[PDB]
Design a protein around this ligand. Structure first.
Ligand SMILES: *[C@@H]1O[C@H](CO)[C@@H](O[C@@H]2O[C@H](CO)[C@@H](O[C@@H]3O[C@H](CO)[C@@H](O)[C@H](O[C@H]4O[C@H](CO)[C@@H](O)[C@H](O)[C@@H]4O)[C@@H]3O)[C@H](O)[C@H]2NC(C)=O)[C@H](O)[C@H]1NC(C)=O
Ligand SMILES: *[C@@H]1O[C@H](CO)[C@@H](O[C@@H]2O[C@H](CO)[C@@H](O[C@@H]3O[C@H](CO)[C@@H](O)[C@H](O)[C@@H]3O)[C@H](O)[C@H]2NC(C)=O)[C@H](O)[C@H]1NC(C)=O
Ligand SMILES: *[C@@H]1O[C@H](CO)[C@@H](O[C@@H]2O[C@H](CO)[C@@H](O[C@@H]3O[C@H](CO)[C@@H](O)[C@H](O)[C@@H]3O)[C@H](O)[C@H]2NC(C)=O)[C@H](O)[C@H]1NC(C)=O
Ligand SMILES: *[C@@H]1O[C@H](CO)[C@@H](O[C@@H]2O[C@H](CO)[C@@H](O)[C@H](O)[C@H]2NC(C)=O)[C@H](O)[C@H]1NC(C)=O
Ligand SMILES: *[C@@H]1O[C@H](CO)[C@@H](O[C@@H]2O[C@H](CO)[C@@H](O)[C@H](O)[C@H]2NC(C)=O)[C@H](O)[C@H]1NC(C)=O
Ligand SMILES: *[C@@H]1O[C@H](CO)[C@@H](O[C@@H]2O[C@H](CO)[C@@H](O)[C@H](O)[C@H]2NC(C)=O)[C@H](O)[C@H]1NC(C)=O
Ligand SMILES: *[C@@H]1O[C@H](CO)[C@@H](O[C@@H]2O[C@H](CO)[C@@H](O)[C@H](O)[C@H]2NC(C)=O)[C@H](O)[C@H]1NC(C)=O
Ligand SMILES: *[C@@H]1O[C@H](CO)[C@@H](O[C@@H]2O[C@H](CO)[C@@H](O)[C@H](O)[C@H]2NC(C)=O)[C@H](O)[C@H]1NC(C)=O
Ligand SMILES: CO[C@]1(C(=O)O)C[C@H](O)[C@@H](NC(C)=O)[C@H]([C@H](O)[C@H](O)COC(C)=O)O1
Ligand SMILES: *[C@@H]1O[C@H](CO)[C@@H](O)[C@H](O)[C@H]1NC(C)=O
Ligand SMILES: *[C@@H]1O[C@H](CO)[C@@H](O)[C@H](O)[C@H]1NC(C)=O
Ligand SMILES: *[C@@H]1O[C@H](CO)[C@@H](O)[C@H](O)[C@H]1NC(C)=O
Ligand SMILES: *[C@@H]1O[C@H](CO)[C@@H](O)[C@H](O)[C@H]1NC(C)=O
Ligand SMILES: *[C@@H]1O[C@H](CO)[C@@H](O)[C@H](O)[C@H]1NC(C)=O
Lengths: 347, 237, 271, 47
């Protein structure tokens, strides 16, 4: 019995357009987009997206309808079929330790949805800086496959998976390959030593591999755990297969695996909604004010004008693009135009 | 000893320092008050004539006597099947001309009996008078440290020693380093705790430096030479 | 001096010979020029006596358009260019048409309305983009010396009027379209009881309602930032920038509506 | 002849006291015995 029509001052958020995008990032990428100064409708969002599960943490779904927030950030990535259980709220799995960490001390909501396998592509890009500096290309995997990391490493700016070839010349047992390292980085630490009768025996660091090494304190590649809102700094490099410029072989990168994401001929994608600031800002919901939106030919709030009256379906052509109310010389209202249905009524 | 601490005058009375020309060279351990166990690489042909040997006991800080207050070694017996190239079967025995009556801070350690069933990563202790950080001087005080025992299969890896650990030798220490024995800790007691009694299981023979990664310590396995010691002690009388 | 951020000091000098000009035309509301339609109301075959904010009949305009090539003067950001927004202004804007490979581009200056021009308060900016009007009310971090750069023929400087790494908090954001081949544009801006109103028109006629926004504060100052263009002078093509402004006052007018609700004539109650 | 296990157990391939340890190694200083044990010499002292 309440007719409430008003023109919005802010545009729509259009979250479904970014969620249903044809490019789906891997858990190593987990692209992020921040939504602010816009209006959203949770019912339409859940209807236009094929929802499988939706739960929230430190926040209830009842208070979402009709609340205003400062900004909303959304993170999305595809889910491997193997590590789907690692996405729970609190778990020491490979995903939450190497790819994406879910914060428990914030008001967040987790969403599991699916996307048709047609015209969808998966982007497997390594965001590591020092990995691509020494000759890392692409994973070269089949379609509908996502890449995840189980061991992530971090190094300083002074790092080079390469030894000085002048020193390696005097080696006979376990002679590592060497090449020319770019300026500003120290070479791989190798030393010449004799055990009992072997004169030329050269010992180096990071043996056999940085994942399973005997001396973690002497290898510059050190294991690290990703934090809140951080990617993996880089993957481990087998220094025995690297090395002109120091170019490591593509088979010398360890600490990554892959698995498909096809379930019931559909691809599963994880989404995390983080709400920054409640009861403030201009990012509000339109669920409460757009409940019915149907005028039966009654209290009305039409563009700020309040009152009561009746309506009728008439043909009016005197309304311009900016005009919505009809007034007489006495100052009363005797008609209006509906900007939702393009129909004019008489009061 | 690197990474250890100076041992207080407690009860570890199985370390004997051998002095030739009035300077400390190699250590040792006592099992009976007539014999001392030590390495054979320090008793080579130039070190013959056991008359030029003396032994000290109950002395932590290495300044308590000079050309006196010591025990003269009568005869020295070395392992016959000893090779100086690969350092295999490095065990020597020395007999004292004095009965060496037992008193405070003087008590030997029993030889390991066959069938100890030791754990792979067992806990052990080392002691000696060696350097402090690297290629230093002789430690004035007696220091010790705690080490772990590593298996022979992992010690014979291509990145550690490349199949140079014979069955007569065992590896002990840490693969990360910072805890090992340097030059001067010859002989040396490698003891462990089991059944409320200490057992001597090792004997410092050689090694590649000290406190370095991928270079653990090599100790002689007295389990194989237990019968030879008994045979020599029986043939002595 | 509008803002408080040090953003650029490449070419800043103290010019001495920039004085606004007074137009030869006056306000004539007989045919309807200088009046605005109601917010969203339609009147058919009526004569309305409306008490609103209208300019005085017979008042002269003043040009606040600034165009610079390389150097920017500090006196351009001080009064009389930084005028007071007491009740409102009626602006007469000229549409400068430039030709690049036989196509038409529309360029004219932009205006900023605010109180202190700091990121702790809201400011209103109206900027055109080749036929599209962009109106935003955000907490913009305005610079000390803002300016606009020609996008049709380029300029030597870069556009710098606000510096914000993230998107500030906005209360209004919407785009409007106008006619590119127009010659003159007219705007109406005023406020009362904390509500800000805006009107616009691309032809010679009463103005068209744009939007309304409740701020709660009082807007005190408005400024028209200079525009840096490569070739607008008496050297390459005889084109000029004009932005005429006249004050607004609470007056009483009489409006006549025809059968189709179009304003025919208007009479100011005070001659 | 031999000895097996952490505890002292007299074995050969499967009372006398001092005489037992006599022709088995240490020819003197017999410490004590037990039941199930030959303890030739004393060991295991720590502070
Ligand atoms: C909201 O507005 C306020 C007020 O303008 C604003 O605070 C300002 O932030 C800037 C940027 O941090 C400050 O500018 C700095 O001022 C110090 C002196 O106090 C200078 O030393 C700084 O210079 C360093 O940084 C330069 C790069 O910007 C380097 O080139 C230079 O070599 C120096 O390393 C810098 O200029 C300014 O002082 C404050 N203002 C006040 C009053 O404190 C605030 O940031 C705005 N908020 C947002 C979200 O934009
Ligand atoms: C406003 O910000 C600009 C930077 O955007 C400040 O300009 C900077 O001023 C410093 C001090 O004069 C300059 O440092 C000097 O650089 C020259 C070489 O260019 C060197 O010879 C001097 O010894 C000194 O190191 C700095 O380069 C300059 N930067 C730029 C890009 O102009 C300016 O001072 C700020 N003004 C204020 C305080 O409002
Ligand atoms: C009103 O119309 C104007 C002009 O068409 C719109 O401005 C345009 O806004 C988009 C969205 O931000 C800009 O795209 C972005 O450009 C930046 C570089 O400035 C780039 O880094 C981003 O990745 C993105 O591509 C676009 O440049 C901008 N155009 C101009 C001329 O400024 C404005 O968004 C419209 N308003 C509304 C509410 O739609
Ligand atoms: C769908 O994904 C593509 C690929 O990431 C998006 O295209 C990128 O959009 C960003 C946003 O400005 C640009 O910075 C990149 O340069 C674009 N890359 C390419 C290759 O075009 C696209 O915007 C996404 N669609 C939506 C609706 O978000
Ligand atoms: C905005 O959100 C409201 C809240 O759900 C939507 O109202 C529902 O709309 C669906 C159909 O779209 C109806 O089946 C429900 O009965 C409505 N809810 C109530 C309480 O009546 C509204 O449709 C949304 N607006 C848009 C444009 O999608
Ligand atoms: C109500 O009528 C207006 C004007 O007739 C419609 O706006 C037009 O919509 C079409 C379709 O998208 C566009 O091509 C035109 O450019 C629009 N014109 C204007 C002036 O905006 C509007 O879509 C109608 N509303 C409904 C719900 O049908
Ligand atoms: C924008 O303004 C131009 C200039 O008046 C309009 O062009 C006129 O259009 C009418 C109607 O077709 C013609 O009779 C005139 O001869 C045109 N004049 C010129 C100079 O071309 C144009 O129609 C306007 N835009 C719109 C959308 O109406
Ligand atoms: C703008 O108009 C002025 C005035 O007509 C032009 O100045 C004349 O230019 C012609 C061509 O160079 C000269 O022959 C005249 O002597 C100039 N008159 C004066 C009074 O100086 C000027 O050229 C025009 N601008 C452009 C770009 O052509
Ligand atoms: C034709 O001259 C322009 C131009 O080159 O486009 C136009 C105009 O004469 C003038 N602009 C202003 C706002 O006064 C401006 C200045 O008179 C001069 O350019 C000097 O400006 C400064 C800051 O020294 O010059
Ligand atoms: C992509 O696939 C979806 C799912 O069927 C379909 O709705 C959409 O039209 C397709 N787009 C193109 C360009 O083929
Ligand atoms: C990718 O892998 C396939 C299958 O082994 C191979 O045929 C192809 O050459 C590879 N491409 C690249 C760029 O490595
Ligand atoms: C600007 O004009 C004023 C007043 O005529 C004068 O005092 C001042 O010196 C002038 N400045 C310059 C740089 O010419
Ligand atoms: C104008 O056209 C010419 C010839 O096609 C071309 O070289 C020039 O780049 C064009 N200018 C612009 C601004 O596109
Ligand atoms: C505009 O930006 C470009 C790109 O960094 C720069 O090279 C140029 O100097 C800038 N111009 C001015 C006037 O700051």
């Amino acid at each position: 019995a309440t007719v409430y029509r008003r023109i919005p001052n802010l545009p729509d958020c259009d979250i479904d357009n970014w969620l249903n995008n044809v490019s789906v990032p891997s858990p190593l990428n987990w692209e992020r987009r921040i939504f602010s100064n816009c209006n959203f409708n949770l019912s339409t969002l859940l209807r236009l997206v094929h929802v499988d599960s939706f739960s929230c943490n430190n926040l209830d779904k009842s208070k979402i309808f009709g609340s205003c927030f400062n900004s909303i950030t959304v993170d999305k990535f595809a889910i491997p079929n193997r590590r789907r259980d690692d996405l729970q709220l609190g778990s020491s799995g490979f995903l939450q330790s190497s790819n994406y960490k879910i914060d428990i001390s914030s008001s967040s909501c987790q969403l599991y949805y699916s996307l048709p396998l047609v015209n969808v592509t998966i982007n497997n890009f390594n965001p590591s800086s020092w990995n691509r500096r020494y000759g890392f290309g692409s994973f070269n995997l089949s379609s509908y496959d996502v890449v995840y990391s189980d061991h992530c490493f971090s190094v300083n700016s002074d790092f080079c998976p390469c030894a000085d070839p002048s020193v390696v010349n005097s080696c006979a047992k376990s002679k590592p390959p060497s090449a020319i390292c770019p300026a500003g980085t120290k070479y791989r630490h190798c030393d010449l030593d004799t055990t009992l009768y072997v004169k030329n025996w050269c010992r180096c660091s990071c043996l056999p591999d940085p994942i399973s090494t005997y001396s973690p304190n002497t290898c510059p590649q050190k294991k690290v755990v990703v934090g809140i809102g951080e990617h993996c700094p880089g993957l481990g490099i087998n220094e025995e297969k690297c090395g002109s410029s120091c170019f490591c072989s593509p088979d010398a990168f360890l600490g990554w695996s892959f698995d498909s994401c096809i379930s019931n001929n559909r691809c599963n994608i994880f989404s995390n909604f983080i709400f920054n600031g409640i009861n403030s800002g201009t990012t509000c919901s339109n669920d409460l004010l757009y409940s019915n939106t149907e005028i039966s030919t009654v209290n009305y709030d039409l563009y700020g004008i309040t009152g009561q009256g009746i309506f009728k379906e008439v043909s009016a052509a005197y309304y311009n693009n900016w005009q919505n109310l009809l007034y007489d010389s006495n100052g009363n209202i005797i008609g209006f135009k509906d900007f939702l249905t393009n129909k004019t009524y008489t009061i | 000893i690197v990474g250890g601490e100076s041992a207080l005058p407690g009860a570890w009375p199985w370390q004997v320092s051998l002095h030739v020309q009035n300077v400390h060279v190699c250590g040792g351990s006592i099992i009976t008050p007539e014999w001392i166990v030590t390495a054979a690489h320090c008793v080579e042909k130039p070190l013959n004539n056991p008359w030029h040997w003396t032994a000290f006991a109950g002395i932590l800080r290495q300044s308590f006597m000079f050309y006196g207050a010591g025990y003269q070694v009568e005869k020295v017996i070395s392992h016959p099947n000893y090779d100086s190239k690969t350092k295999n079967n490095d065990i020597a025995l020395m007999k004292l001309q004095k009965p060496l009556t037992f008193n405070d801070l003087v008590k030997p350690v029993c030889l390991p009996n066959p069938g100890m069933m030791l754990q792979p990563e067992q806990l052990c202790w080392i002691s000696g008078w060696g350097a402090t950080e690297e290629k230093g001087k002789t430690s004035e005080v007696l220091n010790a440290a705690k080490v772990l025992l590593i298996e022979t299969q992992r010690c014979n890896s291509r990145y550690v020693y490349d199949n140079l650990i014979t069955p007569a030798m065992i590896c002990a220490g840490f693969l990360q380093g910072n805890v090992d024995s340097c030059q001067g800790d010859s002989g040396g007691p490698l003891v462990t705790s089991k059944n409320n009694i200490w057992w001597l299981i090792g004997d410092t023979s050689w090694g590649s430096g000290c406190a370095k990664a991928y270079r653990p310590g090599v100790y002689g396995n007295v389990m194989v030479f237990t019968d030879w010691i008994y045979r020599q002690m029986r043939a002595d009388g």
